[PDB]
Amino acid sequence: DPRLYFENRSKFIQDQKDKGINPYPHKFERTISIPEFIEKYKDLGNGEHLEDTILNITGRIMRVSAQKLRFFDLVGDGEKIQVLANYSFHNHEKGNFAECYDKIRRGDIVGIVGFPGKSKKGELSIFPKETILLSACLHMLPMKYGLKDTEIRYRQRYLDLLINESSRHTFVTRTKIINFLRNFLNERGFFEVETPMMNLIANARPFITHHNDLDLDLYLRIATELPLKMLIVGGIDKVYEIGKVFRNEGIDNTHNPEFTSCEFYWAYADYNDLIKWSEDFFSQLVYHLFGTYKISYNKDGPENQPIEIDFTPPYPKVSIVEEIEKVTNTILEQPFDSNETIEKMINIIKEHKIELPNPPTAAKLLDQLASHFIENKYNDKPFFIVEHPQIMSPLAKYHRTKPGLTERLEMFICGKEVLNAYTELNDPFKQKECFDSAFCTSLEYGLPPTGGLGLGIDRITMFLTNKNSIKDVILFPTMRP
Amino acid sequence: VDPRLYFENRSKFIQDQKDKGINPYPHKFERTISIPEFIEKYKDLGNGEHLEDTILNITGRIMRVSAQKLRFFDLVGDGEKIQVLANYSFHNHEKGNFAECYDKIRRGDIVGIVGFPGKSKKGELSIFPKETILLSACLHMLPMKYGLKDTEIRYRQRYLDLLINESSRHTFVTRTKIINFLRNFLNERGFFEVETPMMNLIAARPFITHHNDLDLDLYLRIATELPLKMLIVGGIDKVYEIGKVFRNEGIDNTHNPEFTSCEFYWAYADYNDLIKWSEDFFSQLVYHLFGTYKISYNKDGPENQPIEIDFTPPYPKVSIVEEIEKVTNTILEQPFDSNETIEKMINIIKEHKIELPNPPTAAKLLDQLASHFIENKYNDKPFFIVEHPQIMSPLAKYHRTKPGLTERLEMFICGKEVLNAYTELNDPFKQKECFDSAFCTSLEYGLPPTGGLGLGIDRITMFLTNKNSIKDVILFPTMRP
């Protein structure tokens, strides 16, 4: 019984207390980490002991086996050495050999005083002259299988990190990705800021909460767009923010209501500048992690074959309106709001037995046509969908040569959006929504020509760590109790 | 001079240009060089010297206009400035006539210029235009510095502040330099940056928001303390987070409901390690920014003389129970919850006419005592208040020699708490609050001896950019409309 094992250990904790031994001592003076231990002593010869060097080392006992030789696994920082407790090397003054090492269970945190060496079998080991209990583990830890089907991976992420080596590697990579992005932006002149997480006016339903001092209801931000643009007016010409945004909608495998975004604004940047930034960032980010531009991705899970994703630039550019016509052998033109055009779009959706969006707005229909007919055109390499109609992007600047369109771009990997960008509409007389109030007033003080860009960091982490669910890249995903 | 009329005249002018076939918001300008690169490239040339064969493309905001065929302007970009020297004889009359091109320009307009670099006779570094294009007109009058002084126009329109006030740019660059410095200080030392949920199930009064898909009510984090500690259990022995936390209380000069905190956790660290880290970080940060350990701070406004704060380590330490006892000449006995001891502290509050907190709890009583008798003991230098009673820090580990106390430290600058740290209580049985539930469970898997520490990023910034109010280091402080 896990229940009964917990009570035995808890009684042991009192038992130790009433023998005068504190099972939770204050401080152990460590000399060296486990990863530093492995590097420093990996190339010794087999069976060799460095008996003069005395080290203080800590770690988590992860495996216990045995009659006067005791073997443990000691793990720290995702790496592992062996503990070889020899009765001959023990300091019999500190207590009975057997009594000390019989109390120890898998999962215990211990401090060890000892010397480094390799086994006769060549396993690099610490040879304890003394071993102190530093913090007991009171439950039975599980082994790997316990954490494959269940969702305690998500409710008890600390157990996952201890048991599954890959989980650590996933979450190191996530941190490496964000470091690379921050460094990539800082090296190019960009300036990182923080804008508010609550605002008075907030596409998506907001999180709402009551602010007790102002006696007002506030909204968690759904993006960082408006405050960053104001900083462009203010003269910070390259500005960005990495932080959480919130959309109070349904969960699925690539949608978490709270997620991590990077948005930047680049004054005097145009469409080519933005395309170039996107190809440089992804191609260099992949190479930095993997030493190659090609990665394998299990688009349909580990039970199915992976596809290969090639991040070698340049990436294809697919114009959305033109492409929908070609694959559908249709012609969609004029006001796309034209009921005529709408009907062509609506009849395409029913002929191919697709869901009709409610309401059947021209922007919603075009999006639906793109997810079915364009968004899975390539899967072997990322690509852009470009030049969306103005009705789908009311904040975007008009395309320079094609009427009705914008210079917008969207990057896709395996049919999922990861990057969104366009040049900004800066003539206040043509921004329809200026019939948020602060942004319109700021526009009248002069916004230079500007490009904005946003990245979805969780999804980017999913592809580069071969995950299909967003919960596998968020440390503590929010679940019902 | 009506602000109303000035806007209508500039608006009419914009439509007037559009009717004339000129686009006052052209799509793009191919800038070849920024104003800071211009200054760096040509600051060393000689008086009156021209380089007229080098044509350059430059952009910026017109901030000064002077008054018949030699026009003068001030062009700023990236917080730097050059002169625009418009001469009839180098103006391309192919593109239009000199007088009306330059008569249309107003203070605030964004322009693109093709021209060559040179220095005037009086020595002012200048761009000499051959062609000047409007990129985005400024439609309102731009305030003077004095209009941005007693006002809260600085907060509602931070972009005007950033355009007019040289100092404000410096404040916010400093903030970013501080966070950059902290992140690299921790990364150099093996710490691992992570992200933790902004909404949790169990959480100062909190912000409460409703989650639609789970249909549960969640609380914004008031701290990142608990999940970081769960990552320690899970084997991430050096972990930290920089992000917002939220406290749903009243605004004042050192309290904003959303603020920026950094928290780190360092397994196998104790009181002495955290003290040392604090001194190392603060003394090295001030030296990094200013080149000296000593800075001037206007504790009482820019209207009063500054004080000198010396960050040369080491900083004094002061025991909270002992020191209150000295200055109040009254002994407070170890059962700090005793009716005798509570009554004794209430009386001192009465005798000195201090506010009695509600409820009059021993922890609140000790804090009130500390705020009045210790926390302003030093202003010449930062100092620590240490060894708080267990009843004030129910998550802190017990002091190893003094019964009733902990090994807790709090760092103060100029009467204000900036940093708060302790060895963590890691015995699940001694957790009185463990009658959050996810965290009590996590402790039962074994938390090594750990030291934790939290910093107030906004407060540190105020002291290092000579500010009195937190609103002056937060880009967009939230205020009633």
Ligand SMILES: COc1ccc(OC)c(Nc2ncnc(Nc3ccccc3S(=O)(=O)CCCNC(=O)[C@@H](N)CCCCN)n2)c1
């Ligand atoms: C529909 O939105 C929802 C709705 C409900 C949700 O959960 C309940 C989630 N949640 C969610 N979780 C994780 N990843 C994503 N990625 C995502 C989803 C949809 C579209 C794109 C991405 S994306 O390309 O990865 C990142 C965003 C990029 N673009 C921007 O930031 C623009 N604002 C600034 C561009 C600059 C122009 N001036 N979403 C999202």
Ligand SMILES: COc1ccc(OC)c(Nc2ncnc(Nc3ccccc3S(=O)(=O)CCCNC(=O)[C@@H](N)CCCCN)n2)c1
């Ligand atoms: C009740 O608090 C409120 C209430 C209302 C507010 O606005 C309406 C604000 N708002 C606010 N804005 C800016 N700065 C501050 N600073 C502050 C305030 C009070 C005490 C200290 C500071 S501090 O030293 O700058 C931050 C240090 C935090 N240390 C920690 O969290 C530890 N758990 C770290 C782990 C220790 C090891 N396990 N506060 C705060």
